[PDB]
Amino acid sequence: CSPGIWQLDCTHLEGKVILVAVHVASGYIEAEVIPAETGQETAYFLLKLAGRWPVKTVHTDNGSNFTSTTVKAACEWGGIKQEFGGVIESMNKELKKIIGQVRDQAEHLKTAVQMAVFIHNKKRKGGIGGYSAGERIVDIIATDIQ
Amino acid sequence: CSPGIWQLDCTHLEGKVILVAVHVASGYIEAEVIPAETGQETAYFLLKLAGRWPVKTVHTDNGSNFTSTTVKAACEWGGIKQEFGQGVIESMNKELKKIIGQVRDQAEHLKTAVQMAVFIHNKKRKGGIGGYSAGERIVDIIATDIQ
Ligand SMILES: [Mg+2]
Ligand SMILES: [Mg+2]
C-alpha cells in the first residue's frame, strides 16, 4: 500500500548510530540516534513509529538488527509486514548534509539530528505554495481515510 | 491556533517518568519514558515532536523542566510559543496508565509498554466500530488546515 510503506536503515556519524525511517510516497522522515544498532533499539523505534503513522510494510536491508526476532515480534504485534530486498540512500545522504549545516548550532549530535529532521520535513521546493514532506504525508494519509 | 496547540505534562509509573504530549483538538497523544524529568530531556522530546507535527503553542504547568532555559531555547528555535498554567492532559495520563496496565505483561520493559499503549490509544475507535481514531483526527485536522 503506497500510503503505508516505509523504508528503514542505519547511517553513522561521529561514531554513532542514527536509525532512519522514510515514508516512501512523500519523502517524510524520522530519525534518531540509538545507543546501539540492535534489534531491541530498532524494535523500540518501530513501535513508536507505528503508533504514530499507519505503518503497514517496512522495507530494510539484510541487517542483523532488522532481521532480529525482537523486530519480528514487534512487527507481528503491530501488524507490520516486513520485506528485506533507492530513496533511503538519498535521505541518509541529505540528512547527513543538513546535519552538517546545523551541527555547530547544537551541542550533541542527537539534537543536531532532530534539527535536521525538522528542517528536512519543513523544507519546500515547488512553486509559491508547493508542499513539504510533512504536508505530503498528512495529505496522503488523510485522503486515504476516505 | 486550534490545529497547532499541544499540552505537555509528566506522569509517573514504577518509579519512572513518562513525558506526555496531547494534540488538544484531536486527542492524539505521544508519550515516552525519559531517564529524568529534566529540561534537557523535555527539550529533546519537544524537538522530535515539532519536526513531526505543526507545533505552534505548547501549554504546560509550572514544572521546572517546562520552564527551563533549555526548553525555552528549543521552543524559540522551533518557533513554538509557550504558555504556563485543562482536564484533557489529566484524562490522557489517566487513560494511558490504564492501557499501560492492560498491556504491561506483553512487554519486557515499561518503556515498551508505554509505546504499545500509545499505539492502542491513537488507533482506538469509539465502541470499536467506525468513526475516527485520534490518529485519523489529527491528520484530518492538519490536512484541512493546509488548504
Ligand atoms: Mg544498512
Ligand atoms: Mg505531574
Curated annotation (Swiss-Prot), chain A:
Catalyzes viral DNA integration into the host chromosome, by performing a series of DNA cutting and joining reactions. This enzyme activity takes place after virion entry into a cell and reverse transcription of the RNA genome in dsDNA. The first step in the integration process is 3' processing. This step requires a complex comprising the viral genome, matrix protein, Vpr and integrase. This complex is called the pre-integration complex (PIC). The integrase protein removes 2 nucleotides from each 3' end of the viral DNA, leaving recessed CA OH's at the 3' ends. It comes from Human immunodeficiency virus type 1 group M subtype B (isolate NY5) (HIV-1). It is found in: Virion; Host nucleus; Host cytoplasm. The chain holds residues 1203 to 1356 of 1435 of the full protein. The core domain contains the D-x(n)-D-x(35)-E motif, named for the phylogenetically conserved glutamic acid and aspartic acid residues and the invariant 35 amino acid spacing between the second and third acidic residues. Each acidic residue of the D,D(35)E motif is independently essential for the 3'-processing and strand transfer activities of purified integrase protein. It comes from the Viruses. Homotetramer; may further associate as a homohexadecamer. Part of the pre-integration complex (PIC) which is composed of viral genome, matrix protein, Vpr and integrase. Interacts with human SMARCB1/INI1 and human PSIP1/LEDGF isoform 1. Interacts with human KPNA3; this interaction might play a role in nuclear import of the pre-integration complex. Interacts with human NUP153; this interaction might play a role in nuclear import of the pre-integration complex. Mg(2+) 3 binds at D9, D61, E89. This is Integrase. Residues 1-141 form the Integrase catalytic domain. Disulfide bonds: none annotated.
